[PDB]
Amino acid sequence: ARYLGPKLKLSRREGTDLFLKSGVRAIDTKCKIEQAPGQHGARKPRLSDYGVQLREKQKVRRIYGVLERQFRNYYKEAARLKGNTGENLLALLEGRLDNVVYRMGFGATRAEARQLVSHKAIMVNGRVVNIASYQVSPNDVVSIREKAKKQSRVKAALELAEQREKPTWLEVDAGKMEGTFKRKPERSDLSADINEHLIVELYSK
Amino acid sequence: MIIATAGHVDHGKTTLLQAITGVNADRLPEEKKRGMTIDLGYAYWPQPDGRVPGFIDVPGHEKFLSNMLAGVGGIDHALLVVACDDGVMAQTREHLAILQLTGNPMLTVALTKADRVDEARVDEVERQVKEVLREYGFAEAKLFITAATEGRGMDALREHLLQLPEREHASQHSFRLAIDRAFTVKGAGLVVTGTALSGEVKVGDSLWLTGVNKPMRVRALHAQNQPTETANAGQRIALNIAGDAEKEQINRGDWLLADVPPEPFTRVIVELQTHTPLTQWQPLHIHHAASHVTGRVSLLEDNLAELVFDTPLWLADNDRLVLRDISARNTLAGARVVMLNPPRRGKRKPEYLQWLASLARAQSDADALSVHLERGAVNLADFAWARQLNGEGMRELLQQPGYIQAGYSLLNAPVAARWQRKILDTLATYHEQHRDEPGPGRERLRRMALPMEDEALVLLLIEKMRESGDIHSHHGWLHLPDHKAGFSEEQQAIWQKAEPLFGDEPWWVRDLAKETGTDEQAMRLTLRQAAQQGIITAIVKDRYYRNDRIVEFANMIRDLDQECGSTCAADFRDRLGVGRKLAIQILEYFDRIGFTRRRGNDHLLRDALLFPEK
RNA sequence: GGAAGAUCGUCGUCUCCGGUGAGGCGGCUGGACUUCAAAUCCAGUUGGGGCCGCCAGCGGUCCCGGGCAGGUUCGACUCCUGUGAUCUUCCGCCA
RNA sequence: AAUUGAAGAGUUUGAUCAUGGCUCAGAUUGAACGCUGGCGGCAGGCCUAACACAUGCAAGUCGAACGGUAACAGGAAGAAGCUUGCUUCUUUGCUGACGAGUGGCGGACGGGUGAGUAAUGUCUGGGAAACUGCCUGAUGGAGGGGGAUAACUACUGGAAACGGUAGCUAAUACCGCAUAACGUCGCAAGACCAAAGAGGGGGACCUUCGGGCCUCUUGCCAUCGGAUGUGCCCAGAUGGGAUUAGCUAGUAGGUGGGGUAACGGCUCACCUAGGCGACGAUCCCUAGCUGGUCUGAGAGGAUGACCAGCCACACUGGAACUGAGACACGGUCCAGACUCCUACGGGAGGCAGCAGUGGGGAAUAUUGCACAAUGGGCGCAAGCCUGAUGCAGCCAUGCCGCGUGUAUGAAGAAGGCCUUCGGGUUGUAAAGUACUUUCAGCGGGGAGGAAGGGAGUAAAGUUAAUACCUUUGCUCAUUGACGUUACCCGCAGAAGAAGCACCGGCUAACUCCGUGCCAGCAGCCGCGGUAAUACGGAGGGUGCAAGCGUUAAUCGGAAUUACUGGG
Ligand SMILES: Nc1nc2c(ncn2[C@@H]2O[C@H](COP(=O)(O)OP(=O)(O)NP(=O)(O)O)[C@@H](O)[C@H]2O)c(=O)[nH]1
Ligand SMILES: [Mg+2]
Contact yes or no for B588 and A30 at CB 8 A: yes
B14, B40, B68: which to mutate for ligand 1, most atoms within 8 A of CB?
B14
CA of A86 to C1' of D524 (A): 36
**Positive or negative: CA dihedral B553, B557, B563, B567:** positive
* Chain B: closest CA distance from residue A163 (Å): 7
CA of B189 to C1' of D315 (A): 25
Residue closest to B20 by CA, chosen among B50, B64, B57: B57
CA of B36 to the centre of ligand 2 (A): 6
Nucleotide nearest to A107 (CA to C1'): D406
CA A128 to chain centre: 21
3 state DSSP class of A151? coil
Contacts of B322 (CB under 8 A, 6+ apart): B69, B98, B101, B102, B287, B331, B333, B334, B335
Phi and psi at B241, nearest 5°, equal -125, 145
3 state DSSP class of A75? helix
Angle value at C-alpha B585, between A7 and B521, nearest 5 degrees: 80
List domains and CATH numbers for chain A.
Answer: 7-93+190-203 (1.10.1050.10), 94-181 (3.10.290.10)
Closest residue (by CA) to atom 9 of ligand 1? B12
Phi and psi at A139, nearest 5°, equal 50, 35
Q: Are the C-beta atoms of A75 and A86 separated by less than 8 Å?
A: no
3 state DSSP class of B411? strand
Quick one: which H or E segment has residue B354? Answer: helix B349-359
Q: Which amino acid is at B455?
A: E
Which alpha helices (H) appear in A8-145, and where do they start and end? 8-14, 49-63, 68-80, 85-94, 97-104, 110-118
Mutate to test the interface with A, among B543, B598, B604, B607 (most CBs of A within 10 A): B598
CA of B459 to C1' of D371 (A): 61
Residues 67-96 of A with CB under 7 A from strand D: 67-70, 73, 79-85
CB pairs under 8 A between A and B: 10
Q: Is B27 on the interface with A (CB under 8 A)?
A: no
Q: Are the C-beta atoms of B176 and B218 separated by less than 8 Å?
A: no
Alpha-carbon distances of B317 from A62, B336, B364, rounded to whole Å:
55, 8, 11
Q: Which chain A residues are within 8 Å of B598, Cβ to Cβ? A: 25
Residue closest to B141 by CA, chosen among B120, B110, B99: B110
* Chain B: closest CA distance from residue A22 (Å): 12
**Phi-psi domain of B542 (left: phi exceeds 0; alpha: psi -120 through 50; beta: other):** left
Angle between the N-to-C axes of helices B442-449 and B413-433, in degrees from 0 to 180, rounded to the nearest 10: 100
3 state DSSP class of B103? coil
Residue closest to B288 by CA, chosen among B319, B264, B261, B311: B319
Contact yes or no for A24 and B597 at CB 8 A: yes
CA of B589 to the centre of ligand 2 (A): 95
Q: How many residues does chain A have?
A: 205
- How many Cβ atoms are within 10 Å of B502's Cβ, its own excluded? 20
Contact yes or no for B594 and A24 at CB 8 A: yes
Cβ of A152 near strand D (distance < 7 A): yes
Strands A122-124, A127-128: pairing kind: antiparallel
- The two most distant CA atoms of chain A are separated, in Å, by 55
Q: Is B593 on the interface with A (CB under 8 A)?
A: no
Q: How was this structure determined?
A: cryo-EM
What b/e sequence results for B252-284 when a residue is b if at least 16 CB atoms lie within 10 Å of its CB, and e otherwise?
bbbbbbbeebeeeeebbbbbbbeeeebeeeeeb
B78 secondary structure, DSSP code:
E
Q: What is the dihedral of CA B20, B21, B22, B26, to 10 degrees?
A: -120
**Phi-psi domain of B499 (left: phi exceeds 0; alpha: psi -120 through 50; beta: other):** alpha
What resolution in Å is listed for this PDB structure? 5.3
Which alpha helices (H) appear in B35-89, and where do they start and end? 65-71
Q: Is B599 on the interface with A (CB under 8 A)?
A: yes
Q: Tally helices (H) and strands (E) across chain A.
A: 8, 5
Alpha-carbon distances of A184 from A139, A140, A187, B375, B499, rounded to whole Å:
10, 11, 10, 68, 62
Which is the closest atom of ligand 1 to the Cα of B9?
23
Alpha-carbon distances of B555 from B246, B559, B611, rounded to whole Å:
85, 7, 9
Contacts of A81 (CB under 8 A, 6+ apart): A88
Binding site members of B: 7-14, 57-61, 112-115
Q: Which amino acid is at A173?
A: D
